[PDB]
């Protein structure tokens, strides 16, 4: 394991702290753990799984849907994200997306 990634959307209950590695897509790291987050496509071709990495670093790469401005303003498409350090994420941001 390597990274402790905390996941919160205070108003949704989720306020767990999970261990992830720099090779586990945060989405899966969170589902091993038993809290069940958002996802549809599981491939960077959408937005349902979106979060805003409050502080820290991630690698999206794999993403096909978020455009630059959206990634500069904190949007993470969790499902295909690998943690790059420790990071706290807000779990559900699609209503607010664009």
Per CB under 6 A, contacts with ligand FES among 10-39 are 39
Per CB under 6 A, contacts with ligand FES among 44-63 are 44-46, 48-49
Of the candidates 74, 80, 69, 67, the one whose C-alpha atom is nearest the C-alpha of residue 24 is 80
Beta-ladder partners of 4: 19
Query: Is 49 known as a binding-site position?
Result: yes
Query: Is 79 known as a binding-site position?
Result: yes
Provide the minimum distance between the beta carbon of 22 and ligand FES in the complex, in angstroms, as a whole number.
19
Query: Is 20 known as a binding-site position?
Result: no
The residues, any chain, with a CB within 8 Å of residue 92's CB and separated by 6 or more, are 9, 12, 37, 38, 50, 51
Beta-ladder partners of 75: 52
CB-based contact 84:59 (threshold 8 Å): yes
The yes or no reply on residue 40 touching ligand FES (CB under 6 A) is yes
Q: Note the residues at the interface with ligand FES (CB under 6 A).
A: 39-46, 48-49, 77, 79
Binding annotation: 41, 46, 49, 79
Binding site, annotated residues for [2Fe-2S] cluster: 41, 46, 49, 79
């Amino acid at each position: 394991a390597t990274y402790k990634v905390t996941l919160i959307n205070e108003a949704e209950g989720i306020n767990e702290t999970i261990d992830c590695d720099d090779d586990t897509y945060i989405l899966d790291a969170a589902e091993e753990a038993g809290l069940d987050l958002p996802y549809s496509c599981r491939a960077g071709a959408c937005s349902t799984c979106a979060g805003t990495i409050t502080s820290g670093t991630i690698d999206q790469s794999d993403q096909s849907f978020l455009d630059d401005d959206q990634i500069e303003a904190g949007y993470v498409l969790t499902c295909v994200a690998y943690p790059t350090s420790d990071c706290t994420i807000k779990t559900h941001q699609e209503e607010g997306l664009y």
